[PDB]
Amino acid sequence: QMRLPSADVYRFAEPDSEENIIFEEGIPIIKAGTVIKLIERLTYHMYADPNFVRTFLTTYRSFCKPQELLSLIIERFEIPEPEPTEADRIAIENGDQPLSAELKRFRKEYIQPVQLRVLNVCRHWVEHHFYDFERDAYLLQRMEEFIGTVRGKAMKKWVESITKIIQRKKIANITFQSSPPTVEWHISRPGHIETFDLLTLHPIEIARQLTLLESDLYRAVQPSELVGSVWTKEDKEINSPNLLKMIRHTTNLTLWFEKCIVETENLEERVAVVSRIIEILQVFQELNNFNGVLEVVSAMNSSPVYRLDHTFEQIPSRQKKILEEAHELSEDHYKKYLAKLRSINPPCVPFFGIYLTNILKTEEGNPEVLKRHGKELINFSKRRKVAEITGEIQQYQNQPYCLRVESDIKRFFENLNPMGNSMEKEFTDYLFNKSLEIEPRNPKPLPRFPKKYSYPLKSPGVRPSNPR
C-alpha cells in the first residue's frame, strides 16, 4: 500500500477514525464526517463517485461556505511528492539514474487521480452550480486564477477545457426527429386571439399548450431554489423565483377552471364546461402531465365546485370514471401517483408539491451534525437524502415534449389572470357565492338562468385528427 504525505504537511492524510468519519452499514457510503474527510472522499484516489460529487455540490452550502470550499479543494490539489528512497539514493550516489519506483507509483496512483478528481469537482461546480459564481464575482476570479495557473502536462487538457467552459458560462436545440402532431383548431381560428376561451379552443390543443407551458416551468426549477427550504423563507421571491412562477401558474389554472364553472350560470352550459374540463384532464393523463391532472382535480374538489350536485348528476358516466381515476392518484398520500410516475415513459410533468414537502421534512427532521466521541461531524446522510430528491427532480427535467408551440395559445395561457385585481380571499368568497347563487342550498329551489354562450357547446372530442 502507498505511503502518504505526513498529516502535518498535508491535512487529507489523517487516518480514518470514528472521530472524523462514519460509514453507513462496491464503495463505502458516508453517514457523517468532518469537512476535511468529506472533501478527501469527494476526491478519493481509489475510486470515482460522480453521484457523490452531485450530492456534495448540491448541498454543501449548509455546512461550508463557497469561498471555504474552494480553499479546501485547492489545498487538496497541492500534494507533496515523496523524497527519493534508499535505493534511489544509492543509484544517485553512483552516478546512475534512479528507478524512482515509489515516486512514479505515487504520482500515477495518488496524485494524478486526486488532482483529476479535484478538477472534476471544479468542472461540475462551474457547469452545474454556476450560481455560486454569479452571486460572488471574487469567487469566480479565484476559480479562474486557480485553474489558469495549474501547470503540468498531465492535467493540461482539462485545465484548458475548464478555462474555456468558464468563459462560455460567463457570457451565457432539440432533435426528435419524428415530427410533432398537427396543431388542432376548433371554434377559434388561428390569429383570432380575441375569441380564445375554454370552449372555443380545441380541448386537445388546450391540454398540449398547457403541457408545454407547465413542462417549461417544471424544467426551469434549479436545486438552488430548493436546498435549505428557501422557498418557504422570507427571501423566497429572491431565492426561488422559478419554483414560485411554476406554482402560481398551477394555482391560476385551477382558479380559472373554478371560475369558468361557477360563472356559467345555466345548468346545461355549465355541464358542457365541466365535461370539457374532464376531456382536458384526459389529454393531460395521456401526456403524463401530472401537474395538469392535479390542477383539474383540485378544481373539482374545491368548495365552490364540489357542492354542485345538479351539475354532477348530468356528467356522463364515462367522464365520472375518468375524474375518479385521476382523483384516486392522490389518495393515501399519493400512493398511486407515485407508482404511476415511476412506471410511465417520459416526457412527463411531475407534481412538484410532494418533492417540496419531502425536502422540507428531510431538512427539519434531521440534525445538521452528529456528536461522536466529543466531536461534531457533519451529518451527510441528511444531505444525501435531500440530493436524492433533487436528483429525481432533475431526472424528469431532461426529456422534452415532441409538441409544437402555438404562440398565441401560449400567450393566452401565460396571461391568464382569473383573480383580476382582487385579493385571494375576496376572489375566493366571490366564487363560493357564485356557487351558492347557481345551486342554492337545500331546501331553496333550483333557479333557472339564461344561456351565455352563442356558439355550439358540442365538444370536438379528444381524439386527434390527421389530414395528409
Which residues in 163-202 contact other proteins (CB under 8 A)?
164-165, 168, 173-177
Q: Does 62 engage in binding with other proteins (CB under 8 A)?
A: no
- Binding test (CB under 8 A) with other proteins, winner from 23, 47, 131, 455: 47
Interaction with other proteins in 302-341: which residues (CB under 8 A)? Answer: 302-303, 306-307, 330, 333, 335
| Residue 145 C-beta: closest distance to ligand FW4, Å | 59
Binding partner of residue 330 among ligand FW4, other proteins, none, CB cut-off 5 to 8 Å per kind: other proteins
Distance CA 32, CA 385 (A): 13
Binding partner of residue 157 among other proteins, ligand FW4, none, CB cut-off 5 to 8 Å per kind: other proteins
**Which amino acid appears at position 13 of this protein?**
A
Q: Does 312 engage in binding with ligand FW4 (CB under 6 A)?
A: yes
Binding partner of residue 324 among ligand FW4, other proteins, none, CB cut-off 5 to 8 Å per kind: ligand FW4
Q: Does 48 engage in binding with other proteins (CB under 8 A)?
A: yes
Interaction with other proteins in 74-113: which residues (CB under 8 A)? Answer: 108-109, 112-113
Q: Does 262 engage in binding with ligand FW4 (CB under 6 A)?
A: no
C-alpha distances in Å from residue 331, one per residue of 294, 325, 328: 12, 10, 5
Q: Does 400 engage in binding with other proteins (CB under 8 A)?
A: yes
Strand 375-379 to 369-372 pairing:
antiparallel
- Binding test (CB under 6 A) with ligand FW4, winner from 282, 311, 362, 435: 311
Interaction with other proteins in 199-238: which residues (CB under 8 A)? Answer: 229, 231-234, 236
Interaction with other proteins in 2-31: which residues (CB under 8 A)? Answer: 26-27
| Residue 203 C-beta: closest distance to other proteins, Å | 21
Binding partner of residue 6 among ligand FW4, other proteins, none, CB cut-off 5 to 8 Å per kind: none
Which residues contact ligand FW4 by CB under 6 A?
274, 297, 300-301, 305-306, 308-309, 311-312, 315, 323-324, 327
